[PDB]
Amino acid sequence: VSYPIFTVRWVAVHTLAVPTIFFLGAIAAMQFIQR
Amino acid sequence: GWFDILDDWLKRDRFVFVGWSGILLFPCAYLALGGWLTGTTFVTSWYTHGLASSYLEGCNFLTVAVSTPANSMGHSLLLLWGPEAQGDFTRWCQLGGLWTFIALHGAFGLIGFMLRQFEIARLVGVRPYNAIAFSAPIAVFVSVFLIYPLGQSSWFFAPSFGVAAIFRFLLFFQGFHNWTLNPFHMMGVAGVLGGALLCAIHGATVENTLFQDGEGASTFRAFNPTQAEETYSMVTANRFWSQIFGIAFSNKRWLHFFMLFVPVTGLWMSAIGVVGLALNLRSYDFISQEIRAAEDPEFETFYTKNLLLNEGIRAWMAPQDQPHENFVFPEEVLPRGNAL
Amino acid sequence: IAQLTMIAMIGIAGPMIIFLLAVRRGNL
Amino acid sequence: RIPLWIVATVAGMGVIVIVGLFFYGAYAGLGSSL
Amino acid sequence: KLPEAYAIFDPLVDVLPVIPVLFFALAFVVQAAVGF
Amino acid sequence: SANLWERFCNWVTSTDNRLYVGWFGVIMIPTLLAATICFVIAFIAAPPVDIDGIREPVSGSLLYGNNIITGAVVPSSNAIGLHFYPIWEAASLDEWLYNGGPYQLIIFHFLLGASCYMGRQWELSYRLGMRPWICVAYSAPLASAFAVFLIYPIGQGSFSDGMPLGISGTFNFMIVFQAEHNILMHPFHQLGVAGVFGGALFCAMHGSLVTSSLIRETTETESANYGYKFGQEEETYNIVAAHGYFGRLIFQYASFNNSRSLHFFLAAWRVVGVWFAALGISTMAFNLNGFNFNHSVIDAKGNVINTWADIINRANLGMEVMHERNAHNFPLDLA
Amino acid sequence: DQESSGFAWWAGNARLINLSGKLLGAHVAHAGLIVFWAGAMTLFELAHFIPEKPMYEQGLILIPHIATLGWGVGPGGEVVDTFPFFVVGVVHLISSAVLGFGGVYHAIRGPETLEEYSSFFGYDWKDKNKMTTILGFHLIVLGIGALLLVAKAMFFGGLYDTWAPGGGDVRVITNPTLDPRVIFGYLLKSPFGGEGWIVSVNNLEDVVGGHIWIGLICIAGGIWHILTTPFGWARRAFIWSGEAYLSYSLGALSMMGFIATCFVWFNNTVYPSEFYGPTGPEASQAQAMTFLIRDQKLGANVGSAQGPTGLGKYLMRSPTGEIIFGGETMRFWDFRGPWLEPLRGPNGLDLNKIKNDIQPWQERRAAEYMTHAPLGSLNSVGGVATEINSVNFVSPRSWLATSHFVLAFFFLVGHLWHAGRARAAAAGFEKGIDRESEPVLSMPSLD
Amino acid sequence: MTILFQLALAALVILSFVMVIGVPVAYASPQDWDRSKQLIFLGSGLWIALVLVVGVLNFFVV
Amino acid sequence: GTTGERPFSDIITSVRYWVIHSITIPALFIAGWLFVSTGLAYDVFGTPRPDSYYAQEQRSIPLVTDRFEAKQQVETFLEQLK
């Protein structure tokens, strides 16, 4: 059929997937903060 | 209607259940996961322990922890908008705060989640019992993250929300509360430990007394999701241990129940025990010995021999663990054996 | 210094055989 | 449409590459001891 | 430090050992493509 | 009869003797019978023991001043360490007594017959004709008991440092360890506390659900537990109405419909973590202690920023220092 | 063999136990990673090896073995030829291709069934003789080099001998051991502290000397089984099934690996310490040695110094041998190494010697071993449990002895699960328990 | 020789990286078991030969 | 049980998933990175940067003394503090 892109299920799976990569990028970034 | 519309909706299936409960479970529980996470990644914990608590500071997985409020606050909920912080998300992030946050928001996540165990349970025509068993942690988390601290001096001495920072929580007890030697805690390990076996055994004991009811090398598929058919001969059971251990778990209602008990119970015995530690009521004591420890300088039990380890754990860590006391121990005062 | 780029190729050498096998056929 | 395995391995390597970065990062990373 | 004339390859010599492992890895990639 | 042993042969393997006693049986059965007997007494009434390398006798008998918790039968002394100190090598019975020879007996014995129980743990799964990946579950256990009584000793060279048989003794063996191995910071023990905690959580989970979807057969006056007879043909629980619940309670697919798989998950989790753990001790047995991040986090000038592990380590020194005061006659606790 | 008519994916390799193995090639397949691994790590090792830095100080697990065989070492444990090491890994590595190049084939394009191509000895497990004869080959096979070593030991260069006169030094084993009492006697030797049945081995004369005895003893077995069929109490006793064969066989490793882990932690002979670290006991004995000197050299009498406990600091007394270093160190009065034996005596450590014949070359080797001790964290920060990050070093012995135990352990777990499932075919209840014909639901109730 | 060698050895590697991906796809796709058979013998002797080449080559630059 | 919410394999294997995302995923990976690089994350959460944990000379710890006039403390520390 045609199941929406804005699913209950989705709101959740997102609140996580957005930060995670936001964080993972933040961290991969720190990996070099010498001095 | 008007209510039932809210009900009707939020109540039916849609994969990730969201219920009357969810309203407090999901929000509190979320923030909570976040609350701990943000700290480990970005928030520092220096202004409370002079200790680094974030990847950003250089800490690792086992290092990162979301501090705990300086002994200057005590038990003040330390509010973001409260007199102490005054909605200054950087200072409020600095005076620790996230703690009371993570802990309080969290404290609900549990309340909330257990409810959910009820909600989904009363809706599916089952016995809530699962929801009950779940007290097991609430009691722990309550006593160990709120009660104990609330009983001591400050939110400070409360758990740490760390990996190692939490290991400190151990030793520190062993060293000061000498918890290790506290009956209540004992049943606490008597249940967890005792239960784990119970788990690992029923799990395997079952697997082996499995009726070959499939064809070949995959007894994992041969099982019927559809209907009633004892998959593990309960008979090949008892007549097994009855002869190998002397005893037979004859019945499955009790077996699959006694497993509910074991843990949950011990946990409580733990939560009680720690409640003790709240008001420094601890099992360090053991007079009968110590009284005779005075004289007979030559009589020695492990108890004492152990108790001594503790006495070292104090003298050395207190100064750096409890910074707000500005302890000072000259080279001499420190207890040590001949050698190191 | 370079070490990294040259490791890259070898690492993706294996899934590439799976790919070159997907397209052609066999194995099954 | 896109084959399922092909998304797993490339998704995986990332975890194995990103995670790998993290281990290097502990040697020169601020948290090293130098 | 390998013989002077090999200077060029410290980079690979560096990786060669990872391979062994790599095999248990691939073993999965295939098993996945072959839907188990 | 052609030979009278013929009957001995079927008896040992009597698939119907109240208590099965296999071929392992014939060794287990007494190895523990002697092991236990020495024990029960050593506790009730046994002299002190010089344990540590010196002549500081540590008392561990109820009749010598022990509460049930302080109780413990002590190890062999750093004097013997690994040499075999059996009851005959000692001159006067009292020598064996003092130099702590019961230990070896008790330890060596159970620590042995234990394994045979592990064998006879499976020997019944053969005479009974049941899949036998059961005896293995038992390993993790026996591994540890073996680890804390046989590896670590061979590791540090003396039975001296092998979890002393007694309540407060363990606590000791422990606190010390942390100090010399930072075990708590060890990746293995983790995976250990991992499962144990898990199993203890799963043990309450799987036990929870079953009783939660138990089924019908009772009044309110009657004991709901009564609704079942040994040798039922169909299970008492309504699995569908269980997964149908638990599955739902967060995710639906992170749940088990495959009873065979689930009961299995219960097996392996506890049993696998416990192994790592059993290996953890056995790992640090030869000094590959837990992690260590002391002074690993520093600022510009080099002024050192304490890691939350530096406290771990602080409380660790407090331990290092005291343990075994008098013997340690040198700077480095190289054992 | 596809899915159905096979096992699940995780039990993949089981469908290869069906018919006649499509590939020996699997076994050969990896029989390569194993040889290739030497090719990589060996290259990798030398790839990081400096000649001055103590071999054990530079995570050298692989390289130290070449040295122990007499290659690239000579006087002291010093490395003169960076070449020989390089050689061996280069070879193996390359050598692996052929091993893999073939296993890789045998598994996909050759006879998916060598049961039929059979002929050449061939395939089928129950076939009681094809198996007696096969192992038979691999028996001449091993003993083959038992001599290979004896050669390196007696005809190509020799081995490294720390005991060897002068001092550690590449030496040629001239006169191996005859007497069977000795070479065999070890097995009958104590298992416990004081005498490990395998481990206890002072010199090479008994090693290479013993190996000889094993080459022939082992060859005599391949020659043997290859020619005959196993007796009837044998058949009667042991289950025969491809699996069951792995089952046994596998638990020879388990045991053996422990025998290694228990060996690499204890011997200074076959593991010189100039290539591996100083052995655990050696350490806490080395400390002793260093401080016995520090004070004696500072002006203390040592021998007659009453220690804190009541025993004596520098010198103490053991029950059987009268004299040894005292501390907590006692546990290791069984330790023997060339760096401490000169200062030995009839009754034990000699006061007269230790007092004046204790030379300098010892205080410095003694101090290296006091420091470099088998103590470190996974972190790899060598030292006490609670040391600052700085000097890091983890003894080859740590890794070696540790690993093998966890593996050898795990294997023992294997010997079980493969015996547990195999002893099961023996009656057929391995698939499960038949719902209408179970031994128990039809048996005299225990009571 | 010192110059020739480095191209000689680096050849052997681009040939093996090749030789590798090769045979795998080969035994896999039997459609050209008949033609690729030779793409497999191509590197082979040239590979073995290329190794024996690095042969007398290495005992010449160091 | 009867389940009917928009399937997963669908989209993880979907052509659109990879096209909307390919570009946006690293947008977060990058976003986080920048958050660290600018060095704002620090000022964001007070978290000091290695360059400034202890003042230059002093050896003591900038510890919050009184829960009510704490805001001041922090400052007066962050103050004299570089």
Ligand SMILES: CCCCCCCCCCCCCCCCCC(=O)OC[C@H](CO[C@@H]1O[C@H](CO[C@H]2O[C@H](CO)[C@H](O)[C@H](O)[C@H]2O)[C@H](O)[C@H](O)[C@H]1O)OC(=O)CCCCCCCCCCCCCCCCC
């Ligand atoms: C007498 C009857 C006893 C009854 C016991 C029955 C119990 C059932 C058995 C199960 C476990 C107990 C068995 C003990 C075996 C362990 C070995 C041991 O303890 O004996 C100790 C000895 C140590 O040898 C050392 O030998 C040293 C000699 O070396 C020194 O001197 C040498 C020259 O003489 C060299 O110079 C060298 O450099 C120098 O260091 C010293 O003498 C030491 O005192 C001495 O300890 O080890 C060895 O040689 C023996 C090696 C055997 C292989 C064992 C492998 C590892 C053990 C794993 C256990 C498996 C069980 C697991 C079950 C749970 C799940 C798996």
Ligand code: CLA
């Ligand atoms: C670890 C070593 C190892 C080895 C030697 C094998 C070997 C085998 N497995 Mg197997 N397996 C393993 C690990 C291993 N497995 C693991 C860890 C798992 C868990 C996922 C499995 C799960 C599994 C399943 C479910 C099945 C097998 C099967 C098989 C057999 C069929 C092989 C085949 O069809 O390949 C096909 C090869 C391809 C599709 C392409 C792979 C290309 C490889 C062969 C070349 C790589 C070489 C290298 C990269 C470069 C060298 C090139 C050279 C010319 C220089 C074969 C005996 C099958 C069986 O039942 O056999 C009867 C089977 O159904 N395995």
Ligand code: CLA
């Ligand atoms: C016989 C097994 C064995 C043993 C005892 C060692 C031992 C060692 N290796 Mg090593 N290695 C091995 C196999 C082994 N390796 C193989 C097969 C490879 C090819 C992939 C390598 C590739 C390699 C490299 C590149 C390096 C080493 C290095 C080292 C040294 C330091 C490593 C360390 O401290 O990290 C400790 C590592 C861990 C604690 C890993 C954690 C284990 C987790 C993943 C779970 C493991 C569970 C399981 C039971 C154990 C698996 C066994 C192992 C083969 C993986 C140490 C002497 C370092 C060195 O000394 O340089 C000269 C180094 O740079 N190794």
Ligand code: CLA
């Ligand atoms: C490691 C143990 C091992 C064992 C027991 C076997 C056993 C076997 N292999 Mg084999 N193989 C191995 C390793 C092994 N291989 C390795 C490491 C490779 C990598 C290439 C191969 C590559 C290979 C190929 C391509 C073939 C076999 C084949 C065979 C079977 C033929 C038996 C025969 O009569 O050969 C007897 C061989 C000798 C006595 C060696 C003679 C050496 C000289 C005199 C001439 C050999 C040619 C030359 C030296 C180089 C070989 C070129 C190559 C095309 C053969 C036999 C079952 C054949 C097969 O299909 O079996 C069904 C086959 O076509 N193998």
Ligand code: CLA
């Ligand atoms: C390499 C692997 C290998 C494998 C799997 C086998 C397997 C086998 N061999 Mg064998 N063998 C091998 C290598 C191998 N062998 C080698 C390298 C040789 C060189 C000679 C031999 C020489 C050999 C001979 C001469 C014989 C065998 C036999 C056998 C079969 C019976 C063995 C048996 O079950 O022992 C079980 C034995 C026991 C459990 C002994 C228990 C009794 C104890 C108490 C002995 C008493 C100890 C005594 C006091 C001395 C010390 C005791 C203690 C203190 C240490 C079996 C198939 C027999 C067979 O039937 O055909 C060959 C046989 O006669 N083998």
Ligand code: CLA
């Ligand atoms: C895949 C992981 C792995 C890795 C990287 C290693 C690596 C190593 N093992 Mg080893 N091992 C492993 C798994 C591994 N092992 C397992 C699962 C077992 C069974 C428990 C063993 C049992 C074992 C023993 C008994 C010994 C080793 C030894 C070694 C070292 C020398 C290799 C060797 O012996 O070359 C070729 C063989 C030799 C140099 C000596 C042969 C010993 C004689 C022939 C008895 C039989 C050999 C043994 C049983 C075969 C295993 C060889 C190994 C390559 C797997 C090397 C560091 C040796 C060591 O301690 O360092 C020198 C050693 O004595 N291993």
Ligand SMILES: C=Cc1c(C)c2cc3nc(c4c5[nH]c(cc6nc(cc1[nH]2)C(C)=C6CC)c(C)c5C(=O)[C@@H]4C(=O)OC)[C@@H](CCC(=O)OC/C=C(\C)CCC[C@@H](C)CCC[C@@H](C)CCCC(C)C)[C@H]3C
């Ligand atoms: C070893 C520690 C331990 C962990 C971490 C753990 C974790 C969990 N247990 C659960 C369940 C259970 N545990 C149970 C009994 C037990 N559980 C035990 C021990 C643990 N249980 C022991 C003590 C008993 C043995 C029986 C019962 C049977 C259940 C449930 O059935 C339930 C389940 O079905 O699991 C599948 C899950 C419920 C998820 C949830 O409520 O989220 C929703 C709401 C949450 C969790 C938000 C809470 C936010 C609060 C806690 C903030 C805390 C933030 C910090 C603590 C994070 C710091 C992280 C560190 C690194 C410092 C899961 C969270």
Ligand SMILES: CCCCCCCCCCCCCCCC(=O)O[C@H](COC(=O)CCCCCCCCCCCC)CO[C@@H]1O[C@@H](CO)[C@H](O)[C@H](O)[C@@H]1O
């Ligand atoms: C095999 C898997 C099977 C199952 C078991 C697997 C067990 C794996 C354990 C690994 C856990 C720790 C990882 C190593 C730590 C490391 O090293 O990475 C650090 C942060 O880690 C991390 O951020 C740990 C990430 C874990 C967060 C999980 C939160 C749960 C929510 C996820 C929701 C997803 C939808 C980053 O480095 C740290 O910080 C750096 C500064 O940038 C320093 O330089 C140091 O490197 C310091 O270590």
Ligand SMILES: CC1=C(/C=C/C(C)=C\C=C/C(C)=C/C=C/C=C(C)/C=C/C=C(C)/C=C/C2=C(C)CCCC2(C)C)C(C)(C)CCC1
């Ligand atoms: C260069 C060279 C070479 C080559 C080789 C090879 C052959 C390699 C390899 C390779 C490989 C081949 C590697 C690997 C592998 C694999 C992979 C790459 C995989 C994967 C991945 C991933 C990430 C995954 C993931 C996952 C998940 C998600 C979960 C589970 C499943 C899976 C696994 C899928 C050598 C060394 C010979 C030497 C000479 C030259």
Ligand SMILES: CC1=C(/C=C/C(C)=C\C=C/C(C)=C/C=C/C=C(C)/C=C\C=C(C)\C=C\C2=C(C)CCCC2(C)C)C(C)(C)CCC1
């Ligand atoms: C705090 C805060 C908040 C929120 C928050 C948040 C948003 C958080 C977050 C977040 C998150 C949510 C985080 C996290 C997560 C995740 C992640 C990022 C992860 C991780 C990691 C890692 C590293 C991992 C790894 C791994 C895994 C995953 C598993 C397996 C193994 C491995 C290794 C692969 C609030 C609003 C309340 C308030 C304000 C502030």
Ligand SMILES: CC1=C(\C=C/C(C)=C\C=C/C(C)=C/C=C/C=C(C)/C=C/C=C(C)/C=C/C2=C(C)CCCC2(C)C)C(C)(C)CCC1
């Ligand atoms: C796992 C498996 C597989 C495969 C494979 C195998 C198993 C094996 C093997 C093997 C192999 C895969 C092998 C091999 C090889 C080869 C090699 C490894 C090579 C080479 C060479 C090299 C590496 C070299 C290099 C060089 C030279 C040439 C000289 C100078 C130096 C240099 C470095 C330049 C699969 C996944 C399919 C499945 C089944 C089983």
Ligand SMILES: [Fe+2]
């Ligand atoms: Fe159950």
